[PDB]
Subunit: 239 residues, 4 copies
């Protein structure tokens, strides 16, 4: 149970972030979600329920990250899920897109953590969950920059675990494999796509399955888990 | 919730195995625990409650493992926690102790899994959790054989995940760091031991904290987690 | 032997880069080294000998990286060693320093690789060696940004290996542990510092020892090695 | 150069072990190779040349390992390459074959190392190279036991590095991917097999390519490399 804990989920208006926020609100946390669009943000907060609230934020804009930290200054659980993921071969990758990818995926999260963790350390407790990707642990053509930004987060998980752990603050990564919102038709039919067919479990994850690993690491159930990567990928890393 | 699921925990009469069994019984599983001593085994089963039952077994004895599989043939959750852990330098290690360590920690678990997983695959669902150790991922003098047996389990986690995953059977490892049953006095005083002082969290784990990671991987909450290692070590692997 | 091969070493005027360039020139490569200072650059090139030449370059400046690629367009061996490494706690880390660290350590190397690898792929052979650090695999307080930039390189090693390997181009990382230029007095005396005392080998590396791993991966001796990390750290990662 | 060093290669009469021994003899080492068959052993020793000598040994027989250590008691380089590799699904795996696999691949090497390393530590220098496999790091159906034995060696690499490193003795693993002795016809034709087609380099390794990594780690060039795994697999681990 997360009663009395405040959980901030960046990029929490859809996908993995939305379902992570939904689970934590249903467990009694006071949830704050962020996203770029105010209308979808308010609808996402109403979808989560339980008093969840929306704060508009652009993680690639440090002025916006500053205002986000100012509006949610005291945070016990922080899920760093906001990010972009455009693909291109190394030979095709443009400079503008490279800079945006690192500014949004790494720079914004870094200084948001720097602010939020200061309060956690002063209070003597907290849990930070970085969302990464299997592309940060294996090589997938087209994902060089995206994978590199999330590999930076994997290392920051370890450094932050060492820097904050003496004050009871845990830091971990959740590394998702292929994930897709299930459609109404997907319990029907027989076709298996090439992506799923490569994984031991022979299917893609629904976002809610990734969110269960986030909830675990965020919660006091994982009280002795820190500095680590939890792979939620149907076996992708193991093969 | 684990209602309607049968969970077998080898070495479930004390420590991590006892607390893993306690959590799963409290979540509605029909729990079977094993151990070498019948008196402590029955007392452990009564301590767990919820209809948990004891089956005497010696994992280093294949006749005993055969009888264990015969007495608990249909198993949805299998926690491979039974094991011995005597320490010695490589130069001091004796042949008898080496053979016992691998026969008990690896051989018994291997063929128990071979039997139990056959039923899981036929039914299309199951979860297997191997208990390993930080000594299988980092080098600790005195733990050469013990660490090697649990490293064998870490690889078997990956091979079994690949072999059983197409039929909905998941396999993962829980790698515990320093763990100690807390005493009544341990919230008092100021002394910090050298073991704890090396970990980011600056403390040792209670067995119940390791068991929470076992419960997570055993349960449908980890439905997309397979082939992986969950480190529960206060940051030991990350530093 | 590297006769007929051109090897570019960024940051090759001191330390690991200088000694990597020295070894490759002594093995017959046409060596190009880069660095920020023209006077030290020319002295370093004369120290290496064997026709090694200097090209001034600032990896944090894309105009300079463009001119570097223009001046050394056809490259068979590329050692990405240029980088900065200022330390600070996450709470003390400034925005300016963060941006400089990623622009220099990641952005410059990324687009230099994008240019150099295009020629390697067209020719059907090449070897790229990224210099990283143990701080990208374990958590060391004060090294959050530095470790994160080199973790990005570790992931790029894997993605580039997948993207370039079909055309015979190999990509690997060398991850150095504690390294220090030996002094004349260091074979004398008895004192052992705390840094060395934590490593299995109980000493720090001379840069020439790191360079031997670079030479191996750069050379045809490592013809089947790609996508991997070679740890040169006295055992630091293993403990 | 390995002049004045004695190198013992178990299973050195064919494949990776033969080519590792050939390289070290050509670099001036006094090479001893082992194998089960005396006739092929003497022909292999004559093929290597340079005074290489054969000692018959069965690593699955501790009496034979004792005699091997007695006949080659003072060893500076030890390459643990002897091993068997029969495949079977976990459901098909027999008890006899399991026991033979661990006795040969793990038990024999363990106590051979225990004897040889004692002399290395007393002398203050030595290098031990364990041959493992990609199947010890990723899950491949049919390789459960084989992969598990070599994963035990990977952990022993780390523990031995910690136990022997203070006395200047290094221990590392070489993890080979798909390897095949090239045939005379293989530079001709166009067909690419499924095994090669999965690797970034799109080919299988010749044993001599694995041996180059063994020579590197065995030699003083790798003077600061210990406790680590060198992957020689065409990119297999990275994808
Ligand atoms: Mg910028
Ligand atoms: Mg036996």
């Amino acid at each position: 149970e997360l009663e009395g804990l405040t959980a901030l989920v960046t990029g929490g208006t859809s996908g993995i972030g939305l379902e992570s926020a939904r689970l934590m609100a249903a467990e009694g946390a006071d949830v704050v979600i962020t996203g770029r669009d105010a209308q979808r943000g308010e609808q996402a907060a109403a979808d989560i329920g339980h008093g969840a609230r929306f704060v508009q934020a652009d993680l690639g804009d440090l002025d916006s990250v500053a205002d986000l930290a100012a509006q949610a200054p005291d945070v016990d659980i922080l899920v760093n899920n906001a990010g972009i993921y455009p693909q291109a071969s190394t030979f095709d990758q443009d400079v503008a897109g490279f800079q945006q990818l690192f500014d949004t995926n790494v720079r914004g999260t870094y200084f948001l953590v720097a602010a939020a963790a200061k309060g956690m350390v002063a209070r003597g407790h907290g849990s930070i969950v970085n969302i990464t990707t299997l592309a940060a642990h294996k090589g997938f053509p087209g994902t060089s920059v995206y994978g590199a930004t999330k590999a930076a987060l994997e290392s920051l998980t370890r450094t932050w675990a060492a820097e904050f752990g003496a004050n009871g603050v845990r830091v971990n990564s959740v590394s998702p494999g292929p994930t897709r919102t299930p459609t109404t038709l997907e319990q029907l039919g027989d076709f298996i796509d090439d992506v799923a067919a490569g994984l031991p479990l022979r299917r893609t994850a629904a976002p809610e399955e990734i969110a269960q690993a986030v909830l675990f690491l965020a919660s006091p159930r994982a009280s002795f888990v820190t500095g680590s990567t939890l792979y939620v990928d149907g076996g992708g890393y193991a093969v």
